[PDB]
């Protein structure tokens, strides 16, 4: 069945530190009870565009959050802009915002919201991507399901690095993962 | 849902590593035609592998969870995973009756042959790293091997191992995705 | 379209890295709508890359396998992979006739543009690590790049490289799974 995506162009669609400073490319394809996900990031401007940890040793991580309501609709506090997220139609999107995508949401039994109960690590997936496609420029992408407040479901991407990069543009290789679907 | 075989997504223990029901293996196998998309994680709740302390027990560095299947893809009871809640999905639960056939979910025997006298290829293994407690400095290796057990027609085995000296670290993991070639 | 397009899962050599038919590339592409789920491994059986010795040949550190496709997603004969056994799956074999169209299996050209004077973004690359002989201390990097070859409409290229100093180690790998955005 279907695919929810950001069209795979390079037009900025995401706000990390300043308005439209990045293009998140995210494709979610439903394969029954699992969602197959493919993600990459291009930071085009602003604080995170060029990393220089000699001049700014403190800049070592940032987060992009996707927050969804009970119908699986993206909420406006998300870093990703609402106009950019929809079911695929060709290399573009359907012309009208979708009303329902619960089949694409991370499963709440697998990945419960924060509560008074024990929190398990299975709601996280780690991966490594590479800045500029260079094998000696790893950064970690940590993806977490359903851990944000103010929403019914969430997918968050935390990008971090441990090396001292000097004038390295933050644009990444791609990473694939999956997660258990709500229905 | 006859495209997903799973353990259910709850946290009720279903697996016996060192003692009865000491762990929850969460395993979801989704059939995408000739490939099975697999998602796995592990929570150990009790016993020898629950709290790792390699200062006190320096030799506790690895363990294995085996799923063994018959010619029909039915789980055999000396697998570490219990039979009761390994089944086709129905909602967040399972279908009511135990399944009789799941050959479409078994690892392909031409791709991943049983042990024999013939050359053994590495393609029957997938390696991944998961993280204890979700902490990025607590890696452990998950090694998954297809059809290398005897006394069965098919098998999937998960070997968990680590090389750091962990001190009072609970063995509960992040999730890992992989795929394998299906028998049919 | 649920189909699988593959090399078949046997171990018969189908690929030419340094000399004719020196390797078996096992590649399985399954279409899951707008994404292709890919599973890959490599067995080198002869020639320069069969047994690696970096004490005697320290500069032998990488090689490349290219799949080049025309406008219809048909494999071009200058690819390293041979055309004879690359086809849609039928059982553990292939459909009898060579396929004529597989555009839905090609890497998306907007996501992964062909080479030009325009900025080359890294999103057209996926990196993974596989293990020689299934040994966890024998990593090698598999770098996969989409649509960066000339003389074709689409391409998938696999660059295998390593940084350890291997001494008489056979180049045969564990398996790796990735996905990519489909052209249609
Ligand atoms: Zn710039
Ligand atoms: Zn515990
Ligand atoms: Zn050999």
Helix (H) or strand (E) holding B183: none
Query: Nearest to residue A181, comparing CAs of A75, A65, A28, A66?
Result: A28
Count, residues in chain A? 183
The answer to whether residue C35 neighbours chain A at the CB level (below 8 Å) is: yes
Question: Could you name the CATH architecture of C1-184?
Answer: Sandwich (2.60)
Both structure tokens of B86: 């390994």
Cα B148 to ligand 3 centroid, rounded to whole Å: 20
* CA C169 centroid distance within chain: 21
**Nearest ligand to the C-alpha atom of residue C50:** 3
Residues whose CB falls within 8 Å of the CB of residue A167, separated by 6 or more in sequence, listed in order? A50, A51, A52
The answer to whether residue B151 neighbours chain A at the CB level (below 8 Å) is: no
Resolution (A): 1.4
Cα A167 to ligand 1 centroid, rounded to whole Å: 10
Interface contact A130-C122, CB threshold 8 A: yes
Task: Report the distance separating Cα B122 and Cα C140, nearest Å.
Answer: 13
Obtained via which technique? Answer: X-ray
Q: For the stretch A68-80, what's the b/e string if a residue is b when 16 or more beta carbons lie within 10 angstroms of its beta carbon?
A: beeebbbbeebbb
Chains B and C form CB pairs within 8 A to the count of 73
For domain A1-183, the CATH superfamily is: Adenovirus pIV-related, attachment domain (2.60.90.10)
Strand bridging mode A22-31 / A138-145: unpaired
Residues whose CB falls within 8 Å of the CB of residue A3, separated by 6 or more in sequence, listed in order? A27, A28, A29, A30, A87, A88, C33, C34, C35
The answer to whether residue B6 neighbours chain A at the CB level (below 8 Å) is: yes
Task: Report the distance separating Cα B3 and Cα B90, nearest Å.
Answer: 11
- Give how far Cα A63 sits from Cα of A78, A111, A179, C44, Å: 11, 19, 19, 42
Q: Which chains touch A (3 or more CB pairs under 8 A)?
A: B, C
- Give how far Cα A173 sits from Cα of B126, C32, C122, C180, Å: 21, 21, 5, 12
Q: Where are the domains of chain B?
A: 1-184
What is the full DSSP assignment across A54-71? Answer: TT-TT--EEEEEEEE-TT
Task: Report the distance separating Cα B181 and Cα B33, nearest Å.
Answer: 9
Interface contact C123-A172, CB threshold 8 A: yes
Q: Terminal CA-to-CA distance of chain A, rounded, Å?
A: 13
Task: Report the distance separating Cα B130 and Cα C56, nearest Å.
Answer: 36
Cα B149 to ligand 2 centroid, rounded to whole Å: 30
């Amino acid at each position: 069945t279907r695919t929810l995506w950001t069209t795979p162009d390079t037009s900025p669609n995401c706000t990390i530190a300043q308005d439209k400073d990045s293009k998140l490319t995210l494709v979610l394809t439903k394969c029954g009870s699992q969602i197959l996900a493919n993600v990459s990031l291009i930071v085009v401007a602003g604080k995170y565009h060029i990393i220089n940890n000699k001049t700014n040793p403190k800049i070592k991580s940032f987060t992009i959050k996707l927050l969804f309501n009970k119908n699986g609709v993206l909420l406006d506090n998300s870093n990703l802009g609402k106009a950019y997220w929809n079911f695929r139609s060709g290399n573009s999107n359907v012309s009208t915002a979708y009303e329902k995508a619960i089949g694409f949401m991370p499963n709440l039994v697998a990945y419960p919201k924060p509560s008074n109960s024990k929190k398990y690590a299975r709601d996280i997936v780690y991966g490594t991507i590479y800045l500029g496609g260079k094998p000696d420029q790893p950064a970690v992408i940590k993806t977490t399901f359903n851990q944000e407040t103010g929403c019914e479901y969430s997918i968050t991407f935390n990008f971090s690095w441990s090396k001292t990069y000097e004038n390295v543009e933050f644009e990444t290789t791609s990473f694939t993962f999956s997660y258990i679907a709500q229905e």
